Motif scaffolding. Sequence first.
Motif, PDB file in Angstrom:
ATOM      1  N   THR A 155      13.972  51.193  11.003  1.00 28.07           N
ATOM      2  CA  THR A 155      13.479  50.789   9.660  1.00 28.07           C
ATOM      3  C   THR A 155      12.928  49.374   9.607  1.00 28.07           C
ATOM      4  O   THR A 155      13.340  48.540  10.439  1.00 28.07           O
TER       5      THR A 155
ATOM      6  N   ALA B 104      12.407  45.607   8.729  1.00 32.28           N
ATOM      7  CA  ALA B 104      13.174  44.419   8.388  1.00 32.28           C
ATOM      8  C   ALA B 104      12.261  43.196   8.298  1.00 32.28           C
ATOM      9  O   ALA B 104      11.438  42.953   9.176  1.00 32.28           O
TER      10      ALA B 104
ATOM     11  N   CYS C 127      15.624  44.355   3.963  1.00 35.01           N
ATOM     12  CA  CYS C 127      15.597  45.552   4.791  1.00 35.01           C
ATOM     13  C   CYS C 127      15.208  46.797   4.014  1.00 35.01           C
ATOM     14  O   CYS C 127      15.449  46.909   2.819  1.00 35.01           O
TER      15      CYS C 127
ATOM     16  N   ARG D 122      16.527  50.425   3.680  1.00 36.49           N
ATOM     17  CA  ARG D 122      17.335  51.638   3.832  1.00 36.49           C
ATOM     18  C   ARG D 122      16.383  52.818   3.903  1.00 36.49           C
ATOM     19  O   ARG D 122      15.521  52.944   3.033  1.00 36.49           O
TER      20      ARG D 122
ATOM     21  N   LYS E 158      23.312  46.376   6.240  1.00 34.61           N
ATOM     22  CA  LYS E 158      22.127  46.307   7.125  1.00 34.61           C
ATOM     23  C   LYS E 158      21.752  44.902   7.596  1.00 34.61           C
ATOM     24  O   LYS E 158      21.590  44.648   8.783  1.00 34.61           O
TER      25      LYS E 158
ATOM     26  N   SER F  87      23.613  41.603   8.259  1.00 34.10           N
ATOM     27  CA  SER F  87      24.979  41.307   8.696  1.00 34.10           C
ATOM     28  C   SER F  87      25.214  39.809   8.774  1.00 34.10           C
ATOM     29  O   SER F  87      24.482  39.089   9.442  1.00 34.10           O
TER      30      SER F  87
ATOM     31  N   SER G  75      19.556  40.524  10.769  1.00 34.13           N
ATOM     32  CA  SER G  75      19.090  41.875  10.464  1.00 34.13           C
ATOM     33  C   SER G  75      18.282  42.398  11.636  1.00 34.13           C
ATOM     34  O   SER G  75      17.930  41.657  12.551  1.00 34.13           O
TER      35      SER G  75
ATOM     36  N   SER H  35      15.826  45.881  13.549  1.00 35.24           N
ATOM     37  CA  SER H  35      15.239  47.202  13.656  1.00 35.24           C
ATOM     38  C   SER H  35      15.417  47.715  15.080  1.00 35.24           C
ATOM     39  O   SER H  35      15.661  46.957  16.019  1.00 35.24           O
TER      40      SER H  35
ATOM     41  N   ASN I 258      20.884  51.219  15.753  1.00 33.23           N
ATOM     42  CA  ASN I 258      22.025  50.733  14.971  1.00 33.23           C
ATOM     43  C   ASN I 258      23.264  50.486  15.820  1.00 33.23           C
ATOM     44  O   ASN I 258      23.892  49.433  15.708  1.00 33.23           O
TER      45      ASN I 258
END
Lengths: 239, 164, 90, 234, 244, 247, 246, 246, 249
Positions: I31, I33, I46, I48, I63, I65, I74, I76, I79
């Motif tokens: 995703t 960022a 970010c 979602r 997302k 942190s 953050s 991409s 995860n």
Amino acid sequence: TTIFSPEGRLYQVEYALESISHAGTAIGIMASDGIVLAAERKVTSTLLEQDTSTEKLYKLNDKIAVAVAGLTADAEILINTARIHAQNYLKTYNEDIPVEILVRRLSDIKQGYTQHGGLRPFGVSFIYAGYDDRYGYQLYTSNPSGNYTGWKAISVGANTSAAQTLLQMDYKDDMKVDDAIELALKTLSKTTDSSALTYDRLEFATIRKGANDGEVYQKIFKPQEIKDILVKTGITKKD
Amino acid sequence: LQLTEEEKNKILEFVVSNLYNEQFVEVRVRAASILSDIVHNWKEEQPLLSLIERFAKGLDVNKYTSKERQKLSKTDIKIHGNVLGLGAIISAFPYVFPLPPWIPKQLSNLSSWARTSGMTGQAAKNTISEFKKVRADTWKFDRASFNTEELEDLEGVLWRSYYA
Amino acid sequence: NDRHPLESTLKNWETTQRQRQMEQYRQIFGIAEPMKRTMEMEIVNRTDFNPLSTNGSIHRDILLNKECSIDWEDVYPGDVHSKIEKQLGI
Amino acid sequence: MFRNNYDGDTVTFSPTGRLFQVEYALEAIKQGSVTVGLRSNTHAVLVALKRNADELSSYQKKIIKCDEHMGLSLAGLAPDARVLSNYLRQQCNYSSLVFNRKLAVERAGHLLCDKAQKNTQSYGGRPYGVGLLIIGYDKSGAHLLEFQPSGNVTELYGTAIGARSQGAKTYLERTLDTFIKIDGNPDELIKAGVEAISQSLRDESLTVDNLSIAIVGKDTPFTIYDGEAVAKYI
Amino acid sequence: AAGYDRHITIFSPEGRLYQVEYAFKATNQTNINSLAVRGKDCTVVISQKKVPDKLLDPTTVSYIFCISRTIGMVVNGPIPDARNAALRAKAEAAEFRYKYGYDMPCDVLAKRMANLSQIYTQRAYMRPLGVILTFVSVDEELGPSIYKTDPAGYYVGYKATATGPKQQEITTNLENHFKKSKIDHINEESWEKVVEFAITHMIDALGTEFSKNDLEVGVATKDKFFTLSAENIEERLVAIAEQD
Amino acid sequence: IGTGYDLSNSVFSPDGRNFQVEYAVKAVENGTTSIGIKCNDGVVFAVEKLITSKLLVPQKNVKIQVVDRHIGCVYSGLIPDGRHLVNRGREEAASFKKLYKTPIPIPAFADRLGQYVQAHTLYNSVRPFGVSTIFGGVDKNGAHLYMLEPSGSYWGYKGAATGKGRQSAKAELEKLVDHHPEGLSAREAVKQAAKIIYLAHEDNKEKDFELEISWCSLSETNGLHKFVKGDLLQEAIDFAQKEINGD
Amino acid sequence: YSFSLTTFSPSGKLGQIDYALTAVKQGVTSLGIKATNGVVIATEKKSSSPLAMSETLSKVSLLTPDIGAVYSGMGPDYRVLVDKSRKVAHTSYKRIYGEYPPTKLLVSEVAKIMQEATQSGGVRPFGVSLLIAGHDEFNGFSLYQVDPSGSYFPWKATAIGKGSVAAKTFLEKRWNDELELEDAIHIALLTLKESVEGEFNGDTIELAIIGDENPDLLGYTGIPTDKGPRFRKLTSQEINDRLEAL
Amino acid sequence: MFLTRSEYDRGVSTFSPEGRLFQVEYSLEAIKLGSTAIGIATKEGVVLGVEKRATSPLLESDSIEKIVEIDRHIGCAMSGLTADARSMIEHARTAAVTHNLYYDEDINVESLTQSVCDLALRFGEEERLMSRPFGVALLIAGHDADDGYQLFHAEPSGTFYRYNAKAIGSGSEGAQAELLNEWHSSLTLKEAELLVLKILKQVMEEKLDENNAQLSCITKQDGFKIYDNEKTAELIKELKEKEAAE
Amino acid sequence: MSGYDRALSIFSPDGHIFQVEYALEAVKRGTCAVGVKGKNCVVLGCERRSTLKLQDTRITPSKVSKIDSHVVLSFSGLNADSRILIEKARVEAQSHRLTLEDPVTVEYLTRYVAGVQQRYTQSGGVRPFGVSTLIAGFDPRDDEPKLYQTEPSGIYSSWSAQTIGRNSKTVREFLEKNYDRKEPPATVEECVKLTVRSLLEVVQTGAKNIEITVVKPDSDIVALSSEEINQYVTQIEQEKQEQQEQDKK
């Protein structure tokens, strides 16, 4: 051998995900006052010991349970590591382990077996369940990649897609644990490859509160208790 | 298999006159790499012997003492284009197994320039090193097509930082 | 020091007894015997990594002649990325 | 058209008993500039041609010192010639500290053989790509060792290593009695090497910068010449 | 060639470790037949001696090894692999006698050696030795005894085991003697008659007479395993020739 | 459908043989011809040394190696592998002498030397030694002569020959052991060793050579291994010459 | 470093373990039956020669005084697992709790040893399937199968090796939840009589039971607290006497 | 075109039949693909300069500084920047400070160059040998009391030369030809600056200005300094009038 | 090193088509960022993916942190990998203070992260991380906003605005038009408004998909809730209606 496909994707993780896509179905549902776990067990063996105490469903401590899709040999290595971590947290802090700390703990070990080329990944998907004061009743899922996610209701293993659609239309945020009993049994009977659901093909459990204010109780159901929720629910394979 | 004998001739004298480009040295090396592609596709010998003569005219002589052959190799676009053009002819022949007797003879003129420590000798070192590399799987059979002194004239071409 | 007399001896016992054995085999059988025995142990130790299991190895107990013997060290024993980047070098 | 199956690994043998990777490691000696080694009864000499990559570029180092009594030249791989020469200096110091002699050059030969043969016998490496001429003087007189990287060595009155060295080698071989007698006049032993190395220069010329000379015999220890130090020897 | 399946100890689709099956062909590289038998109070090992070159010293050709005071073995396979396995068996008996305060049984040494062969039969970087080991002793627990061990790490007891490229004829003649005599040992009270009996069976099976230098012998009594010299073998060959 | 069995060392071919140890003996079959002759009280070693240029320094390039003091060693094939197996032998005997306070038995030096060479046939991480060794000496049981292969195989011999000339050499060694069944003397073995070596050089008649010889006789050299030189060497050279010029 | 073995095949299969189950499927059959008051484990002994003394090749093995084991597959792999299994029982459990481990805790530990051989470079998985059978004060009588995967299963009855599908069909047809130990012995002797490659008698057949305690076999009197071995290996005369009742 | 492949190409730690290591040789060909960097040594200072590729306006300059300080008397030009280039430079920084605190004096530039080449022979961090390449070409420039102003081309091979003048990146042939046709032992610092700008102009394709070109020098008095855009502009103006003055 | 440059046809060295290039492919599929600096703040934002109907929002991880009280990360790409990469950075920063009486510097939190990523590139048949990150915050005793990007190869760079993951071309194009480096967003509100406009062009549906964290000097870290970013989205959509109706025709 833990190398990327040219799309930036891991062949071994995809093959471990193909393996768990055969590995028997499990449903978990988070009611307003408890969590339900249920799993469907392919008993093609008459001489296999049903009324063995576990296969799909396991305790991790006094308020946490799991369901397993995948290899049970792989799952039991992670399950013991989680049990050791739960008691090592309780020993350190004098307090019961929060569910997020333990679910992601098993998600960090399973990612490591995907990066180093000497290790095959673990062929296991876990639908965790539990209670703690930080959040309340929590339902999580984790898979061979080391990804983990929070849910109100989820399926893993075989027939995930049909099960997610059936959950989505009947789930309500305000439902009680006995409504989640009914829902998880209905969902599995509406998803099963076997002709009808019965107490030995089914593993069941609950995480209720009971009558007494300090209690949270994890009945992993023995076969006779499962026969009672079967005959109450209207699945009722009864004389 | 599309161009005619007037279009391929225009292409040739354009790439050959790019071998003597007075301003660019990158356009003189690029042109050799393409004159190799023109020469590889020739089916008869009389064009090639006349090109060898054109490129060998500035070469194939003891007219230069070593100090001329050295200082001209730092400066002279004409012999730079002729060495690049003759290396373009040599490298057009990577896998002809019985090695044509003109190849050892023309390698002998290039290997005089390969000792000269500048842009003209560089084109010769690159030619001989590329030649030995393609002929590294045949070399026990191709070593017979040279004299003892000619094989020694092929030796010392790698001026790399890690070769002493 | 205040530290128990037996502590440094029992810490190094497993290493010391094998190091002493290899020197006897060098003396009685020549350099080939501990060169053979150290390379067998190298193949067994180096090709047997699994971040979640630390409980020895089955073939190392055959090689070490420990396949039917218990020490207190076997009844009383005493991060996967940190194991990975030690096994491969950091 | 003639693929060799048996030259991938240093540990493979050919069906005819050849170690092809090791024979390829010798062909790396032919990639260097010429160096010539020769000896009399009382002196050993090295003379070396040094290359550059461009006219702006400092010339390559060819002679290396291990101790007051011995050193070497390197026509092969320069960065790999730093591995062997480091190990030889380490062994000279080990002899002065642990045995209080200095490492007689025959003993130096045996140690280089051992180190190179180890590379030649084990998986997960390569043969050394370098040939060494080692020169020294000790209680057994003036000594000259040609180390070849297969893990071998030989005692020799003289030799040449590098590209086009068959010329210089054949001049030493046609002019041997000339250099073996020379002794107390070391500059003619230097001019003997300079004639020999001149045969490998195909109308290239020696220059003040292109050439380096080193000598080690009797009291005069191991020394190296550069610039005008080699102008009186052109 | 099927890739790694044939070149390392790993299972074929069939389940065959080609590293072990090929090591059983290595044991027949000597072209030697050996025979072992139990008497009443002894166990005996007789082995074919090949010395084709005039230039050999027959005193240095031997496939019989003294493993300790009471135990000994014949090896079938290449001598480099027979001397390696003999040196292990000597060390394993010595360390057992130290640890447990009594002499290493033949059964225990055959098991210990067979457990070592199971390593090379599972670890991909370890190859199974190219030898069969035939241990014999007079154990105080099992009297005269014979134990055989192989490249796959499978070992079992025996009363007349034999290894060689003509072993089937010797074994088939042994089975027919034990079938008619019905006792599981040869009933001689002295080892001289046992060895003579063991040279009568190898003559009859291999279709050739033997000189005193073309034969080997072993004599395992209580308190001693020992090897015979050519004149002690010729005393037995003379007694065979005196009987027939 | 392929033969990858010969590319690696810890591998049996289908017949059950290590092909790298079979290619390592081919490196010996290219080697310098050398022999050892065993007498009634000692061991003689002799070698034909090829002199590929005059530059080869005299009496300092040596093919006979003195392992310990009471043992001799001549090897053929890859020269670096013999040097490595000659240095390990010297360590082996020096260890036994510091520990047991007696010279090592030749049968025991042979066993320790034959276990080190077999260990390099076990693992794919190493190659076999491409050299064969002849070694031997006088101990408390008298004269022993051994020959050891790339495979680790070794036996004791009455006379042993290795390298390029081994065929012609073995046939002459058989004549010796047949004419002299009881055995030949120390002085008869040096003369006859020179004859065998010159006769083996008839394969390579254009490649000029030197002969190098050594003793190890209980009577001639007090049981120590020692070099053969001067008049006894010239008396051997003249015997070799008068019998090969057989007119 | 491209180093592992037993990696995943694209259809979601482990491959090498599949080849390890083909080695198990080639072994001399072994089988096990659980009864109301005891358990039985059984196998045939295949001789490499009739000169071999198969009093030396035990196939049925004591793990603890209340636990037995048998294999099908590669016997060498089974001699090495049995001695680790014995060491495990003493070091992990007897030396902490002064009592031997149950037959679910020892089966987990054997299976953990076989799982570690699948998830490794350098090692092939085991060529054996193990039947482990036993008794414990709170679980009662139990039988389990362990495969090269490190998967373990509780069984009422099972068989493994060549004759295993015909044995498992006979075990389904004959098993009922009220069997006693003399009944289960007869069913096991009947099942091996169909699977036998060689001759059938008390010398070729291995048979063990975990049954009642046998105070004779404890070898010392004075301590009733110590009940005496449940595991008993049938003598060759008992097997021939029961084979006369067949 | 026609194909010219050998069987020795792509060999790792292997010699061709000539001895050619083709991983380290194919790494030495990347000195034509980078952005142009030039060094000019003199008796007055070592002038280093690099062509800038025009950035997004959002990328802030300190992210891509291809002229760098190792120490007050040493700096690198790179033709291309990688994590390994910052690894070489931060090893050079850590090596220069660890030298100054152990030996109480400033590092010799030859010895620093050798220490970054030793990192390349190790392949970062078994016998250290020259088999595989590491990182990128550095022009290391510096000044010390013993060997003066020095320009080193440190290569991926762990070997180097000192040069009087060296060009790397996509101008290499035409630049080095004009450098060797034009360099003097009489170059002043000013003339070394105009010379590097005249060379840069000729390769860059673009009109040379203070936004597409970067200059620096090591001087012994001032230390290492990267030049101000205003200073390169007044130098570029001076180049314009020097050629207009013809 | 790619495309149409090919001498005498071509053949490959050890070089470009490699594990690290396939890790860059994994990062682009994760995703979007984004991060933008301001006069005295930095905002990370970010995407979602739009949450599934049965997903549990109150426990879903943010997302973006927090690595320490003054540093935010953050990502991409993968995860699971980012979770393993944030753990190393968090303990690295807590360990920094415990051994240096100094909170970790933003530039040392970027050299460490990219540094550990580089070691999993270098060798060993251990794969590189399929992850690219924004690292943002303030140093202690300073008021300068910092913002770094790291990549799977272990290369890192400083930006006054940047975007990584899906569709990031179109976002970087919008930022180059709307972010002026002379006059950056002078107030937190404008900085947040710029990130909401930037993300609104690339997100799946709307206010569901955006989530932002604002970092300010002196450890003032502040996640914005759904309700706060709904009033930003609504204000921006009001200005679109206003701009359209302010058409003159």
